[PDB]
Amino acid sequence: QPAHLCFRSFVEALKVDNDLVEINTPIDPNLEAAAITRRVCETNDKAPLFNNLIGMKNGLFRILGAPGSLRKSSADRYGRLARHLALPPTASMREILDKMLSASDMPPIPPTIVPTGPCKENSLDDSEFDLTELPVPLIHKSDGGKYIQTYGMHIVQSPDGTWTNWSIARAMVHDKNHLTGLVIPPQHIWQIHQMWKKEGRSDVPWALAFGVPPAAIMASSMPIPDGVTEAGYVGAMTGSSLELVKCDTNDLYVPATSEIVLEGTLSISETGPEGPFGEMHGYIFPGDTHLGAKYKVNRITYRNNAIMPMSSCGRLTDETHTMIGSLAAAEIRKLCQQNDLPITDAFAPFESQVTWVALRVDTEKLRAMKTTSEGFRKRVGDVVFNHKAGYTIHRLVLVGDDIDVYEGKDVLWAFSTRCRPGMDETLFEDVRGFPGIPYMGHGNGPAHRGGKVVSDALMPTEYTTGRNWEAADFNQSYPEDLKQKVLDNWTKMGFSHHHH
Amino acid sequence: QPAHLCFRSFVEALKVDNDLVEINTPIDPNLEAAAITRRVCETNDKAPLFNNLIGMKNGLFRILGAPGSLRKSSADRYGRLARHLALPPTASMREILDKMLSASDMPPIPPTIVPTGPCKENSLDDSEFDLTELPVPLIHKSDGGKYIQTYGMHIVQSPDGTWTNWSIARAMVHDKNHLTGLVIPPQHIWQIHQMWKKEGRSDVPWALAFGVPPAAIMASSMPIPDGVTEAGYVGAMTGSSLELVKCDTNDLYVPATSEIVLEGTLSISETGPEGPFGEMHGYIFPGDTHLGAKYKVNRITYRNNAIMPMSSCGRLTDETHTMIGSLAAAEIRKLCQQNDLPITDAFAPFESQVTWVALRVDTEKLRAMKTTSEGFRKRVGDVVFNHKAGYTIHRLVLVGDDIDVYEGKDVLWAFSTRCRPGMDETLFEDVRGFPGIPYMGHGNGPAHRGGKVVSDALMPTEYTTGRNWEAADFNQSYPEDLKQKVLDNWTKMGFSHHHH
Ligand SMILES: Cc1cc2c3c(c1C)C(C)(C)C[C@H]1C(C(=O)O)=C(c4ccccc4)[C@]4(C(=O)NC(=O)N=C4N2C[C@H](O)[C@H](O)[C@H](O)COP(=O)(O)O)N31
Ligand SMILES: Cc1cc2c3c(c1C)C(C)(C)C[C@H]1C(C(=O)O)=C(c4ccccc4)[C@]4(C(=O)NC(=O)N=C4N2C[C@H](O)[C@H](O)[C@H](O)COP(=O)(O)O)N31
Ligand SMILES: O=C(O)C#Cc1ccccc1
Ligand SMILES: O=C(O)C#Cc1ccccc1
Ligand SMILES: [K+]
Ligand SMILES: [K+]
Ligand SMILES: [K+]
Ligand SMILES: [K+]
Ligand SMILES: [Mn+2]
Ligand SMILES: [Mn+2]
């Protein structure tokens, strides 16, 4: 099966790419696996596959860390993401995000139901598993529980059957047959939960599938629109209908090749302790246990020699940056274009801890709008900060056509030199805020409201007659013939490969 | 003579360090020398010494580019700066800035007058030179003149004789015997000019010395206090009295080993076209000629085989970042401490185009002040933004003790995650602004006023009971024994020098 459609094949792809380290000696799921993975993420090393996990019994489970993290070389920096999508390993960020957006004006390709698949190779009923007995990792030393769920896909469906959502949200072991996890507005798992709570009749039928098709976990991490079933979006993106099998204990459908499947319910009434957790912005607040949603597990099915993917998230660079930030930026780009705003590109700079998005402006189009900074900033911030795709983003930086938004150094240069603090900014206090940013949930103001800004790094003439500067750089401040001469003579004079 | 006390010896030091490329074939001062130097600065390559400059006649002149730019290795990143100061080439930024501040509570060591020196080896009177005939570089393709002066020291003295200032300010050739240049408030060359203009009797006696003692050019680039003669500060810093010779045509004194000396006057009445110029923030606005101060040159003296230092400034990284930003940050650190503010360290991040300074706070001391963010931000911004040392800096970022302000990645992380836009900031509109930042002089508001901000990246408990988080990083989220095990087993497992 192709790597983008089968997790097991994706692991083989990473080996083939010389992007995997198999560790066959005993590794402790209590911190050691996550510490190795953390080190990998901070140094852009090869993904670790822990084949000999202390506590693994009856096939549950091996761990793959860092599934969507960065490679060291520039040329295939984003190769792990490209391997989620059937793209060449050298694919650019622009190409990856375009692939993730391509299904947005395609007819969905609904999934195909098949009678069985590898995820049914083994099963454990209500009398045979105990989640406290599995080798669930402790990811960070102060975490409030063992976070089984960092890279699986929650599956919930609207009461009326018309929308089946796939998404990543964290969850930790509560007891032998329950998890607790984040289920928070405006996320789709929360929106669907709310529908079931209002109906008031039953808990939410649920499944959590780990080691799903890589193209599916990418869509699970993207804020595609309300009401859109991810399976059909992934079908359209990949050009193929995804093969799903029915759960044993409910009528939800899971990818046929899922490594591990939990079946059960998301309670409409109960909660339990959840967190603290070392989160995407790089922090844990030890002891800040909060209450989270409560899941009951009724059944486990799994592949022979099942592999659990794990994100050891925190400081740069991991899945929470590469996928959350970039996929939100992609959706934001499209949302802006659909609202008639002249945005060509969007990216969440890693330097911002993916709390900013830089928006590249087609300034020819801007000039024809005959507008001003104040007006344009307000328009852009109203579109983005009032939408779910803007939830995680607290600062938008508007830049003109000379800036490559995928290059954080150039975004930082433009921000620092073209946006006058205060005057060239509009603050938004009456929008939903993201509590997980420390200055929100652990800060001086309301955790859930405000703290957002549009920073205009367009220069004045970009609105009127055109750019009126040249950069004082090698590229722009010397003629072409001279630049080439310099390059041609560089090593000869005594100064000094793409792949590496 | 020691490298920090003699420019010629400094050039030999750079050779010895394998940090020099001598170019002995013809190089054009029209753009080519500066293009090579620009390329060096953008890639942290070896400094170029142009020994065969097209247009050099009768010993005037060779060029050394990139005298204070960065080296490629981490271990001796700042080695060129260290060679200005007699420090080991591995010296840290903290050590360099401490050396630059050390003279601030030492008695000055006044200079020693000697009867002659190498700078008197050759001379050209009023009938023998023509500045338009020298190989003065065109540094950037749109510059409004040939900028002879990018790394020499202007020498002017108060009318009463009590203060002799040494400073870097740009200047370009106007005609055969005049320059134009920046002389702007609040700079000391401007403050002294104003004194002469108010007296109204004569033009300002002036000298411009190129290839001065490296320790002197560092002080020339630092905002040491009003009224303080740089020569005595450098004497105290180096522990030695600097040897100076008298000018021939006025009673100013120049370093004995200066490569090239211009003697003349700074007019109290005349101006001429100055700029545009590719400046420290990375921009040129072609055609924006402004008027600048006008200098008359009466005499040139110079060393045999004289060398002109040149800064090919603009985008990262050159002297305008390494020296302007870092030396302003050093002075700011001291100013804050002298105003009883609990600041341990300051640095201007390169990522900010040296428009920010990050201030590291001793949070034990902060807690004892029993204050709040609003109050503390206002106090800090009042101290810094009302002082000349704060002139170039438009954003201050307050960070706690866990952040190394010399590491831009960590400053950016803290800023992005700990400072809530708006609420955790205080804007300053009634302070002097820096017009050279594009969003000031070419922006939407007053060029000379406002646009400054204090951004508080201290978390709430840092004011009260202490830090209440741990980072989700390898360092902080795993015990010491486990971290060491991981490191010890890293290459064995299959993953992977300080000098490189
Ligand atoms: C990739 C990823 C992702 C994610 C995550 C992760 C990962 C790896 C982890 C590791 C697990 C971490 C975590 C976090 C932390 O940080 O902890 C987080 C947060 C983030 C943001 C926000 C808030 C929270 C999560 C949770 O928990 N919750 C939620 O909610 N979400 C989320 N995410 C996101 C998501 O996925 C999106 O958003 C879509 O979009 C969904 O879908 P829809 O369908 O709804 O649209 N997570
Ligand atoms: C290192 C360096 C330095 C500098 C410079 C340079 C260099 C290399 C060049 C290349 C030439 C460039 C230029 C610029 C540009 O960018 O163009 C500039 C600006 C800068 C800022 C500001 C405004 C301007 C200068 C001019 O021009 N002017 C002035 O004013 N200044 C200045 N600087 C600074 C200085 O030096 C300090 O500030 C002290 O401190 C002084 O002293 P006192 O004594 O007064 O204190 N410059
Ligand atoms: O209570 C909410 O709406 C929330 C939240 C949150 C928690 C942890 C990490 C990210 C968001
Ligand atoms: O007119 C002033 O006060 C000024 C100025 C300026 C010009 C160019 C680069 C930096 C400062
Ligand atoms: K999703
Ligand atoms: K602007
Ligand atoms: K100075
Ligand atoms: K703060
Ligand atoms: Mn969804
Ligand atoms: Mn001075």
Give Cα B143 distance to the centre of its chain: 21
- Searching chain B, which residue's CA lies closest to the CA of residue A281? B417
The residue behind tokens 């302000």 is B405
Neighbour-count burial for B403-432, b at 16+ CB within 10 Å, e otherwise: bbbbebebbbbbbbbbbbbbbbbbebeebb
Residues of A in contact with B141 (CB under 8 A): 470, 477-479
Rounded (5°) CA angle A127-A128-A134? 130
Cα–Cα distance measured from residue B258 to residue A429, given in angstroms and rounded to the nearest whole number: 59
Considering only CA atoms, give the Rg of chain B.
24
Contact B266, B298 (CB under 8 A): no
| Bond preceding residue B317 cis, omega within 30 of 0 | yes
Contact A70, A317 (CB under 8 A): yes
Q: Given in angstroms, what resolution was this structure solved at?
A: 1.1
Give the pair of three-digit tokens for residue A425.
């900014």
Nearest to A396 by CA among A383, A407, B282: A383
Helix axis angle for B480-493 and A32-43, nearest 10°, is 70
Residues of B in contact with A142 (CB under 8 A): 470, 477
Looking at the complex, report in whole angstroms how far the Cα of residue B236 sits from the nearest Cα belonging to chain A. 36
With a CB-CB cutoff of 8 Å, which residues 393-432 of chain B face chain A?
Answer: 394-395, 409, 412-413, 416-425, 427, 429
User: Cβ–Cβ of B352/A416 closer than 8 Å?
Assistant: yes
The residue nearest atom 29 of ligand 1, judged by CA position, is: A169
Instruction: Write out the binding residues of B for prenylated FMN.
Output: 165-170, 187-188, 230, 388
Which ligand lies nearest the alpha carbon of B281?
2
Q: Are strands B47-50 and B62-65 parallel, antiparallel or unpaired?
A: antiparallel
CA distance to A399, B293, B446, B451, per residue, from B434 (Å): 22, 18, 10, 9
User: Cβ–Cβ of B470/A283 closer than 8 Å?
Assistant: yes
Cα–Cα distance measured from residue A242 to residue A261, given in angstroms and rounded to the nearest whole number: 17
Nearest to B270 by CA among B293, B290, B301: B293
Q: How determined?
A: X-ray
Considering CB atoms only, which of B424, B442, B474 is closest to A35? Answer: B474
Q: Is A241 exposed, middle or buried (0-12, 13-18, 19+ CB in 10 A)?
A: middle
Contact A362, A401 (CB under 8 A): yes
Cα–Cα distance measured from residue B281 to residue A492, given in angstroms and rounded to the nearest whole number: 31
With a CB-CB cutoff of 8 Å, which residues 137-166 of chain B face chain A?
Answer: 140-142
User: Cβ–Cβ of A285/B468 closer than 8 Å?
Assistant: yes
The amino acid present at A407, given as its one-letter code, is E
Instruction: Write out the binding residues of A for prenylated FMN.
Output: 165-170, 187-188, 230, 388
Q: Which residues contact B193 (CB under 8 A, 6 or more apart)?
A: B156, B183, B204, B266, B268, B293
The HSE-up count of residue A75 (CA atoms within 13 Å, CB side) is: 4
Residues of A in contact with B18 (CB under 8 A): none
Cα–Cα distance measured from residue B90 to residue A421, given in angstroms and rounded to the nearest whole number: 37
Nearest to B323 by CA among B192, B168, B452: B168
- C-alpha A421 to ligand 7 mean position (Å): 28
Question: Domain locations in chain A?
Answer: 1-330, 331-459, 460-500
With a CB-CB cutoff of 8 Å, which residues 338-367 of chain B face chain A?
Answer: 351-353, 355-356
Cα–Cα distance measured from residue A410 to residue B315, given in angstroms and rounded to the nearest whole number: 10
B321 in reach of chain A (CB within 8 A): no
**Chain B interface test: which of A19, A289, A315 (most B C-beta within 10 Å):** A315
Cα–Cα distance measured from residue A365 to residue A375, given in angstroms and rounded to the nearest whole number: 15
Q: Which of B279, B319, B425, B462 is catalytic?
A: B279
> For chain B, what is the total number of helices (H) and then of strands (E)?
14, 22
Residue B149 DSSP symbol: B
Residue A350 DSSP symbol: G
Residues of B in contact with A470 (CB under 8 A): 140-142, 283-284, 286
Looking at the complex, report in whole angstroms how far the Cα of residue B35 sits from the nearest Cα belonging to chain A. 6
For residue B102, the cross-strand partners are: none
